[PDB]
């Protein structure tokens, strides 16, 4: 397995079994040493204040978050960021249906859009009550992050001056979203509570509630 | 006046899965050192030790059946027991139904067995050396 790259002669098959045995002993000791280290007790790359939640946003009850949010922060979110799995994938409608009006009273949004669903995002979040404002453009090849705002950002909380909208890849030929955007937020809201939907373990930064099926 | 270190634990208790945060509320870094879907919960290590008494060392297929409802990895059982028996090769122990109290003795006796002959690594006695 694969059946065609495998040997069929006895001399070829015995030789291969002999080398696999040696190799299982090798990856055995690497797995004991891995588990023991993890066991007693290694530290992950995750910051301590991060707040992961593995759930499916269709199945997830947002009210459980809403209530536990008010219970602890005393306020709804300041900044919400998204990277919808456009159509592993979610029907364009499903994400549209998500109750993101409930989730934030006054603050910003950040939605990542590919050229194919660029227009869709605008009317997706104008539905969410957000007012389209600004576009952050990422150069790797282009991907656009659309920004919106509802209610009042007049409060002193937010900082009007913006880190330059443009942004670059931390590495060359990279596919994960770049970290700088988490400091754009940090300039825009320092130590503000933030939500990320469609998060990923490498999107785990502290101060951030991250919801993702892959967390 | 919003304490984020307390706000983090206070959220993790009410929203995060049982695997992500300790009832303490702090973060369970053991969970992120293993890929998503291949983490080994403690409710799984007790499920295995239990399987050794009812089905013995060799019958992984049968154990995965009763304790893990057919979802666990036969080879991850095959290895996690080596760590229970502190030995790299468990061919000797094939088919022996071993009580949970006999396992620690078998581990301690194989660790100490390992320690003496300097054939011990990573709390595991390597009776097979390549």
């Amino acid at each position: 397995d694969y059946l065609d790259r495998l040997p069929k002669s006895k001399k070829g098959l015995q030789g291969l079994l002999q080398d696999i045995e040696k190799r299982i002993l090798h990856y055995k000791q690497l797995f004991f040493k891995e588990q023991n280290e993890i066991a007693n007790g290694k530290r992950s790359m995750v910051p301590d204040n991060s707040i992961p939640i593995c759930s499916d946003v269709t199945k997830l009850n947002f009210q459980a978050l809403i209530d536990a949010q008010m219970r602890h922060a005393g306020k709804m979110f300041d900044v919400i960021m998204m990277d919808p799995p456009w159509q592993d994938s979610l029907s364009d409608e499903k994400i549209q249906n998500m109750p993101i009006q409930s989730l934030q009273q006054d603050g910003f949004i950040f939605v990542w859009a590919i050229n194919a669903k660029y227009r869709v995002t605008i009317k997706m979040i104008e539905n969410w009550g957000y007012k389209l404002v600004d576009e952050i453009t990422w150069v790797k090849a282009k991907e656009s992050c659309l920004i919106g705002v509802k209610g009042d950002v007049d409060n002193g909380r937010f900082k009007k001056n913006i880190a330059s909208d443009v942004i670059f890849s931390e590495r060359r030929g990279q596919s994960q979203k770049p970290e700088e955007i988490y400091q754009y937020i940090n300039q825009l809201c320092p130590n503000g509570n933030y939500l990320e939907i469609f998060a990923r373990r490498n999107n785990l930064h502290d101060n951030w509630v991250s919801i993702g099926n892959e967390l | 006046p919003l304490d984020f270190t307390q706000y983090a634990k206070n959220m993790r208790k009410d929203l995060s899965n049982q695997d992500i945060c300790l009832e303490d509320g702090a973060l369970n870094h053991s969970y992120f050192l293993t890929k998503k879907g291949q983490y080994w919960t403690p409710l799984n290590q007790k499920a295995l030790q239990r399987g050794i008494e009812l089905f013995g060392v060799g019958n992984w297929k049968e154990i995965n059946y009763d304790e893990f409802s057919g979802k666990a990895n036969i080879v991850e059982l095959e290895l996690r027991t080596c760590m229970i028996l502190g030995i790299n090769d468990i061919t000797e122990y094939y088919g022996k139904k071993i009580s949970e109290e006999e396992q620690e003795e078998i581990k301690k006796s194989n660790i100490a067995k390992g320690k003496k002959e300097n054939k011990l690594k990573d709390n595991i006695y390597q009776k097979l050396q390549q």
Partner: peptide
């Protein structure tokens, strides 16, 4: 990139297939 577990899984499954062809003879 693979993990240590995933590699051991391929290795065991491979071992089973070859042991099957070694027995088929």
């Amino acid at each position: 990139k693979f993990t240590n577990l995933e590699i051991l899984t391929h290795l065991y499954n491979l071992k089973a297939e070859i042991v099957r062809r070694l027995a088929e003879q």
